[PDB]
């Protein structure tokens, strides 16, 4: 009963469509509970300078009751029946989803269609969520991770929509009226730009007929030159350095232009990011850690936490790393990190690739363990890749990545490329850009 | 879908439980659950659990500290350690083709640790870290105190080493602690994504060590009382509980249902927790940011039940009383069958969800396997939830309002009441 074979026994996610557009999606297991939800191509990238921060506003209001269920009914009906209701916005995506008992699936699917379609947007409620969000923005202001990552975006994609935060500038929050939100809603929540995903105990076609029942009644098509197109966002080699000394630790994020959801490199880049890995002071490994950056960092306390990332978007991304550290360890942490990138680009040993591959393999299988995970995979896979992808395919793609590939691929995206750098905190040590830029090439 | 399987089960001659669902996932997940949490630390060798937790991957008999860390990472595995106030849970993960390597490194860590003076001495200051990282959350303070106020001998013991003991834990004390508590009569071997023959074969051969509990716990003599750490945070955290009943009795279930009647947690993102009895009761005299929820702890030896208050600075007096009154007027008997029937769904679903992912499942299988004898499939749990009458609930609320009180508070406690002012 091998790993290769175990990939065969995986339920092939079943997907249908409607005349009105809504793709329907589901993976069946014999799970007594399930997860089902709506996935949408909307957010702060589709937003624009004047209406920025609205997708967050809608997400806020969506659970404050519909027309067919006024006040806090929508809430109580889901609360009392036991199930769980959640939602989130990003730069390129929005999802509203419910965890429920298998038997409740029919009732569940109904409520979602109501949240999406028949949202109240009470004028008294708008001013209630206006004070909420203003305070949710002060919270983030003291979460250096979130701040640095938004800065990285700002200066990586300066002058384009991606540069925009999902939450939106504190002005807009204070001056967005119903008119703006309703418009956003009707202009962006269209049935072909949406997916209905679910996984657990359910048979595909039970969902599909519930979709015909409650989602046929949704806006079924769109008008001609109103449903927007996405402009490519320019990546700009740049730096943004918020020097604040009174903070205990410095956060930095550095990244080069990623490939985009589309591109097949995203496998060899995940393999590569797995090799350099990730770390924090509470890891057991210490010096014996396989990632030389992690072991160096651990023995010398260069940092108290660092993680590589591959943030992906439509036709671009951010491929880099982030670290939290002491006001005097920044240069060294940076030096070791860039070192590793250049080491990968120019010499990437064979076995260390085989370590990455397996870490990644482990990652995706043990990531898709639950319903909430797989429902969310299905929900986005369609919104980005166009289809869902079998673990058996991901495996094939991983199994083709070897030393020569990892290098060609890393060399392609790192070697001699202008990176984008966000630094927040006591960063007087954080190297000069002209220095950092020279860290991206070799034969010194 | 594929074809559901019987969670197999065995109990070797020396009391050692073995269990194994073979659900043909690509991943394999193996736990070795042991009765060696904080409760079994005596009044001298404190923190020895905590250090022992961190001490996974110090050199063992068959594998060096290096070989352990690098070997697992070479296949991208994972060797986790999960302690409760009662149980330690050394749990591995990996692909189903590597199971024997990860099994191997697991047995060395448990049966054959060396605890070298210079490694154990080098590890010590991690206690300082791991503790401080965790006491970021002001809850940990409050809960740690609460058990130390409530109970004495065994469960009063913290999960995190006390201050004075950081550094002072000897490698002898680990040898001793492992020798005394890592025994066949205190251990269950749980397997997910592995066949039963091999889990047995390995258990017989390499886990058959002295099966004689080398120490036993006490009976958890409940004391009761109050601990108050004045420290000026913006908010104030305070928990108030009373002697509940242990897990495995049908009286536990009545407290579980009593919980979801009062307060569970958010079920709908960003809502006002409309259904939550406690939140709603304390929703109405006090107009501010605040929080309250129902605390329900339940171990083999004993249990706690009551509420947790995250109030304002000066709203502590109001919130803690107002919430108490609301539980009182349940003990007095204001409980419609609808309210029990809602809570029974919350719990029925809440349980069923909490074993959905392999991660929780294994922790419940190993939980049952140790706590009492063999696995109790979900249907029986869902049935036993239904079994609880509407009397037992009000009797649980009666046992609280009447029962002996434990309170643990930390924040600015100027306007915080004491058990006698409550």
């Amino acid at each position: 009963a091998t790993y290769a074979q175990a990939l065969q026994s995986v339920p092939e996610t079943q997907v249908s469509q409607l005349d009105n557009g809504l793709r329907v999606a589901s993976e069946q297991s014999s799970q007594p509970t399930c997860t089902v939800g709506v996935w949408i191509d909307a957010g702060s990238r589709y937003e624009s300078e004047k209406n920025n921060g609205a997708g967050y506003f809608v997400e806020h209001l969506a659970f404050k009751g519909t027309k067919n269920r006024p006040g806090n009914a929508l809430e109580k009906e889901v609360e009392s029946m036991g199930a769980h209701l959640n939602a989130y916005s990003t730069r390129e995506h929005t999802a509203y989803y419910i965890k429920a008992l298998s038997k409740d699936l029919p009732k569940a699917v109904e409520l979602l269609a109501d949240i999406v379609q028949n949202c109240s947007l009470e004028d008294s409620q708008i001013e209630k969520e206006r004070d909420v969000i203003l305070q949710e923005l002060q919270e983030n202001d003291t979460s250096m991770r979130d701040v640095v990552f938004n800065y990285l975006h700002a200066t990586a994609f300066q002058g384009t929509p991606l540069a925009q935060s999902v939450e939106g500038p504190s002005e807009n929050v204070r001056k967005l009226s119903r008119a703006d939100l309703t418009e956003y809603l009707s202009r962006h929540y269209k049935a072909p730009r949406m997916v209905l995903a679910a996984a657990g105990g359910l048979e595909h076609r039970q969902l599909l007929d519930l979709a015909q029942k409650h989602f046929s009644g949704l806006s079924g098509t769109y008008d001609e030159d109103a449903v927007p197109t996405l402009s490519p966002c320019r990546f700009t080699g740049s730096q943004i350095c918020h020097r604040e000394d009174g903070l205990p630790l410095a956060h930095v994020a550095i990244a080069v232009e990623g490939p985009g959801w589309a591109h097949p490199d995203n496998v060899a880049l995940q393999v590569a990011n797995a090799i350099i890995g990730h770390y924090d002071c509470t890891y057991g490994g210490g010096a014996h850690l396989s990632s030389p950056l992690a072991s160096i960092a651990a023995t010398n306390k260069l940092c108290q936490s660092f993680q590589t990332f591959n943030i992906c978007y439509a036709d671009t991304g951010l491929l880099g790393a982030h670290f939290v550290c002491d006001h005097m360890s920044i240069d060294d942490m940076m030096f070791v990190l860039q070192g590793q990138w250049m080491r990968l680009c120019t010499s990437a040993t064979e076995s260390e690739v085989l370590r990455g591959k397996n870490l990644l393999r482990n990652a995706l299988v043990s990531h898709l363990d639950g319903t909430t995970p797989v429902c969310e995979d299905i929900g986005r896979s369609l919104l980005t890749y166009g289809r869902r992808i079998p673990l058996a395919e991901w495996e094939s793609r991983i199994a083709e990545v070897d030393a020569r590939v990892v290098r060609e691929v890393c060399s392609k995206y790192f070697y001699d490329q202008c990176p984008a750098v966000a630094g927040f905190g006591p960063i007087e040590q954080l190297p000069d850009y002209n220095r950092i830029r020279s860290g991206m090439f070799w034969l010194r | 879908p594929p074809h559901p399987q019987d969670l197999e089960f065995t109990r070797l001659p020396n009391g050692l439980v073995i269990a194994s669902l073979e659900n043909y996932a690509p991943a394999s997940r193996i736990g070795l659950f042991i009765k060696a949490g904080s409760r079994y630390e005596n009044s001298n060798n404190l923190g020895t659990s905590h250090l022992l937790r961190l001490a996974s991957s110090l050199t063992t008999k068959g594998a060096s500290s290096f070989k352990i860390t690098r070997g697992i990472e070479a296949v991208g595995g994972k060797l986790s350690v999960t302690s409760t106030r009662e149980n330690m849970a050394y749990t591995v993960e990996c692909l189903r083709d590597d199971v024997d390597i990860l099994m191997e490194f697991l047995l060395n860590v448990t049966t054959a640790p060396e605890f070298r003076r210079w490694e154990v001495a080098a590890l010590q200051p991690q206690l300082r870290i791991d503790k401080a990282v965790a006491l970021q959350n002001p809850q940990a303070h409050v809960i740690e105190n609460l058990h130390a106020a409530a109970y004495r001998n065994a469960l009063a013991n913290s999960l995190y080493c006390p201050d004075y003991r950081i550094g002072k834990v000897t490698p002898v004390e680990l040898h001793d602690y492992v020798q005394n508590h890592f025994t066949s009569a205190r251990m269950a071997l749980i397997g997910l994504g592995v066949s039963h023959p091999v889990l047995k074969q390995v258990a017989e051969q390499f886990l058959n060590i002295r099966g004689g509990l080398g120490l036993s716990g006490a009976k958890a003599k409940y004391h009761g009382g109050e601990i108050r750490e004045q420290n000026g945070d913006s908010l104030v955290h305070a928990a108030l509980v009373a002697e509940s009943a242990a897990i495995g009795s049908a009286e536990a279930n009545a407290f579980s249902v009593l919980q979801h009647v009062l307060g569970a947690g958010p079920h709908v993102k960003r809502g006002s927790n409309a259904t939550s009895s406690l939140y709603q009761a304390v929703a109405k005299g006090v107009h501010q940011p605040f929080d309250v929820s129902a605390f329900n702890a339940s171990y083999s030896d004993s249990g706690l039940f009551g509420f947790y208050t995250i109030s304002q600075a000066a709203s502590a007096g109001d919130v803690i009383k107002a919430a108490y009154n609301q539980v009182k007027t349940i003990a007095q008997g204001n409980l419609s069958n609808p309210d029990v029937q809602a809570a029974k769904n919350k719990l029925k679903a809440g349980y069923l969800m909490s074993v959905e992912s392999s991660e929780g499942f294994l922790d419940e299988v190993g939980s049952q396997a140790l706590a009492a004898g063999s696995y109790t499939p979900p249907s029986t749990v869902l049935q036993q939830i239904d079994a609880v009458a509407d009397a037992d609930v009000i009797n649980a609320a009666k046992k609280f309002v009447s029962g002996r009180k434990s309170m643990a508070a930390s924040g600015n406690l100027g306007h915080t009441p004491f058990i006698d002012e409550l």
Binding site: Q135, T282 | S57, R270, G271
Partner: peptide, 21 residues
């Protein structure tokens, strides 16, 4: 750290941060 949306088992490992359930 933040505030404003409020409505034991210890755990440590070799690859995960420590969590307090």
């Amino acid at each position: 750290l933040c505030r404003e949306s409020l409505r034991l088992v210890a755990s440590v490992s070799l690859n995960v941060p420590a969590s307090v359930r």
